[PDB]
């Protein structure tokens, strides 16, 4: 549960590194093992998390 958050989240353009830092301005400890199944498994969830990410780092 790792390498799937990678999988997930190169669509857009981070690179988890980036997404990792961003958690925690969300101040959503997440995608730390096993969230990662919703990454890819369950894209209706993961994009509520990406969603949070998304304000939080990205357009912020």
């Not at 990678?6 to 830092?21: D, E, K, P």
């Amino acid at each position: 549960w790792i390498a799937r958050i990678n999988a997930a989240v190169r669509a857009y353009g981070l690179n988890y590194s980036t997404f990792i830092n961003g958690l925690k301005k969300a101040g959503i400890e997440l995608d730390r093992k096993i969230l990662a199944d919703m990454a890819v498994r369950d894209p209706q969830a993961f994009e509520q998390v990406v969603n949070k990410v998304k304000e939080a780092l990205q357009v912020q």
